[PDB]
């Protein structure tokens, strides 16, 4: 069985789909037309891929309306491949089997179904090989498209939708993919796909052609009868001419295209051809037949998302190793310039500069954290509609294994290198306080980065906004301008500065109990005014409280900012347009 039907389809975004009828039988059903037509807009309507606000038709499966879980029981092959190139083919479709299936069955059954899919599709030669990223090379385009096809074949879908499987391929593997689809349909399985500029070498395989032009249906019926249909309409197909291009030239309306026939008689272009089809025998025959008629837990889908993200992170040691190496080099260089901090007139300047630069670098290094939910937006949307997981599990999995371990490490590397090569304060607690403050600054900057770019499609706009925001945050830090000289109507802006919160904590940690005047006991009293001989005087002059609360409130503020920004990012992901 598994026969799809759609009656009186009308979609309004500007009505983009006029009255469209059709029955897709088990076979190889193709949708053809120009790019601006309803060719692509009808595939996403037949599958639950568009918002039902504008759909005014009636679509049925075996004469009954489709259930709620129709998207979970019907594969959809996205045009652009969303396979992760870092994982292998077997691991990619193993990840798919582990989420899209049920957890009642053991791993042996999931694995044997995986084996059956890769054998049926013919993916045994490159079963255990990497797909291939842009830097490292793996399998070629045909087998990548085949892997993407097999990703949704795991749950043996009854109906399979494909969005232009030929586009982005070449003239050699396109026929291989089409023959694979035909062989799969020979057992009997509805396969509906969009096609762009086919060849006659693949046209003979179609069993039901659907021609669309500007939302108007222009032909529907057997694919082998279309050429005769358009021949009997007064359009001759020249010898050695592609029937698909022959149809498209009529649809577009090129005068230099095929010539007319001879007329024996006894609405510019688009409303005459459709009207011809309305009063045709195919329309009556179609209308008579038309009128005759979660699964996985939260943890189970958190572990798998986190594992896939970790494998993706480790698969290309080029984004983590690069920043690790640059952090190691920067720490050594900084320790080289600032070697041997002295307790003299120049000690305060050096300490302030080295503590400010570390915080500024920790803040500015999180700008590159917008490649977390931007480069994977399409894949996330596809797997959310398909029913892999929910937003919370994806958000936490991409957080535990992508942002948590790649932000903590640079702070540790910086702190264990620059500290003793400088000689800030030889105490056990100060070292850990500095490391903790750097970790919080990095985490806060990364969380704000995520909150800004949480559903955008490009990075050229989020990065500029974040850079311009961090510049203003750096202005209100405490070194470039004295925070006690600000006007009352502008001093409040300092409370929205992450670098200020980090820098204040670092300074309060470093400058407590230091004398900066050789041979002057200013601890008792200061015999000379305008002296700033003692570290406490510098802290008070900078507007910093001397109580331990004046240190820990910085971390309290940083944690509050972390929570607010993470919640904002999760809400932005939750209310994303999923269609």
């Amino acid at each position, epitope marked *: 069985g598994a026969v799809l039907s759609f009656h009186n389809i009308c979609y309004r975004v500007k009505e983009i789909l006029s009255n469209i009828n059709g029955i897709m039988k088990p076979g190889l059903n193709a949708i053809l037309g120009p790019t601006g037509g309803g060719k692509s807009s009808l595939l996403d309507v037949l599958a639950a891929r568009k918002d039902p606000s504008g759909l005014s038709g009636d679509v049925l499966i075996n004469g009954a309306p489709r259930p709620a879980n129709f998207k979970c029981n019907s594969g959809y092959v996205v045009q652009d491949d969303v396979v992760m190139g870092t994982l292998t083919v077997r691991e990619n479709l193993q990840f798919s089997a582990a989420l899209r299936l049920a957890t009642t069955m053991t791993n042996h059954e999931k694995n044997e179904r995986i084996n059956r899919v890769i054998q049926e599709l013919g993916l045994d030669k490159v079963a255990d090989s990497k797909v291939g990223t842009q830097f490292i090379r793996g399998v070629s385009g045909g087998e990548r498209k085949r892997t993407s096809i097999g990703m949704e074949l795991i749950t043996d879908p009854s109906i399979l939708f494909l969005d232009e499987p030929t586009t982005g391929l070449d003239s050699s593997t396109a026929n291989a993919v089409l023959l694979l689809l035909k062989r799969m349909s020979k057992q009997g399985r509805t396969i509906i796909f969009s096609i762009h500029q086919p060849r006659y070498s693949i046209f003979k395989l179609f069993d039901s052609l659907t021609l669309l032009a500007s939302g108007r249906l222009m032909f529907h019926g057997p694919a*082998q*009868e279309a*050429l*005769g*249909y358009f*021949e*009997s*309409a*007064g359009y001759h*197909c020249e010898a050695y001419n592609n029937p698909a291009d022959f149809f498209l030239d009529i649809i577009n309306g090129d005068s230099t295209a095929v010539a007319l*026939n*001879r*007329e*024996e*008689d*006894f609405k510019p272009l688009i409303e005459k051809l459709a009207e*011809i089809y309305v*009063n*045709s*025998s*195919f*329309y*009556k*025959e179609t209308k008579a037949e038309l009128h005759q008629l979660y699964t996985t837990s939260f943890c189970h889908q958190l572990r798998w998302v986190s594992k896939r993200s970790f494998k993706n992170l480790l698969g290309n040691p080029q984004a983590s190793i690069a920043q690790i190496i640059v952090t190691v080099v920067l720490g050594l260089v900084i320790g080289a310039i600032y070697f041997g901090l002295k307790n003299d007139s120049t000690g305060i300047q050096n300490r302030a500069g080295v503590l400010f630069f570390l915080t500024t670098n920790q803040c500015f290094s999180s700008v590159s954290a917008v490649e977390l939910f931007v480069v994977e937006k399409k894949l996330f949307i596809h797997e959310y509609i398909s029913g892999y997981y929910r937003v919370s599990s994806y958000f936490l999995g991409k957080l535990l294994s992508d942002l948590l371990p790649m932000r903590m490490l640079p702070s540790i590397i910086f702190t264990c290198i620059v500290y003793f090569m400088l000689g800030l304060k030889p105490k056990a607690d100060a070292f850990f306080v500095m490391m903790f403050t750097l970790m919080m600054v990095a985490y806060s900057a990364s969380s704000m980065a995520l909150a800004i770019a949480a559903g955008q499609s490009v990075v050229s706009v989020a990065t500029l906004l974040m850079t311009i925001c961090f510049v203003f945050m750096m202005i209100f830090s405490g070194l470039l301008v004295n925070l006690t000289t600000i006007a009352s109507w502008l001093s409040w802006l300092q409370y929205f500065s992450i670098p200020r919160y980090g820098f204040t904590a670092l300074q309060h940690n470093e400058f407590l109990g230091q004398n900066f005047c050789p041979g002057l006991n200013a601890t008792g009293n200061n015999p000379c005014n305008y002296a700033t001989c003692t570290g406490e005087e510098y802290l008070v002059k900078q507007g910093i409280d001397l109580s331990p609360w004046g240190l820990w409130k910085n971390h309290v503020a940083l944690a509050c900012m972390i929570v607010i920004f993470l919640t904002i990012a999760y809400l932005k992901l939750l209310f994303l347009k999923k269609y």
Partner: nanobody
Framework: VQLQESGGGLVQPGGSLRLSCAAS????????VGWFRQAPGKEREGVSC????????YYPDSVKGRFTISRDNAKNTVYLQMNSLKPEDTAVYYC?????????????????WGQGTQVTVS
């Protein structure tokens, strides 16, 4: 994919001859065929029609005697019989088709496909 027709060359007038309008590639059951007549020196005039749902219809001018019609879907063809004398002789007899559902054949267009046969009458 092409639409051909076959006839014959009659020697003595008054005989009965059957022309066939065959089409290959596409089935004719979805279409309505029309037999048109042209001669080297006259104008273009049709003979009659065929309906895809009901029976046959006839809208001729002076040829209203023994012209029968038959559409055979098993062989995917239609036929034209001639029995009467019919002093009109040696016509090309083109054969066209068009796809409509409504009645009143004579209001269609009948786009033609190919060249025709030729008959002889003494």
């Amino acid at each position: 994919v092409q639409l051909q027709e076959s006839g014959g060359g009659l020697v003595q007038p008054g005989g009965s001859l059957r022309l066939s309008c065959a089409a290959s590639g596409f089935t004719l059951g979805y279409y309505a065929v029309g037999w048109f007549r042209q001669a080297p020196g006259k104008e273009r005039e049709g003979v009659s029609c065929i309906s895809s749902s009901d029976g046959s219809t006839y809208y001729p001018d002076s040829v209203k005697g023994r012209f029968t019609i038959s559409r055979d879907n098993a062989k995917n063809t239609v036929y034209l019989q001639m029995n009467s004398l019919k002093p009109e002789d040696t016509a090309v007899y083109y054969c066209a088709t068009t796809v409509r559902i409504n009645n009143s054949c004579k209001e269609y267009q009948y786009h033609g496909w190919g060249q025709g046969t030729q008959v002889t009458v003494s």
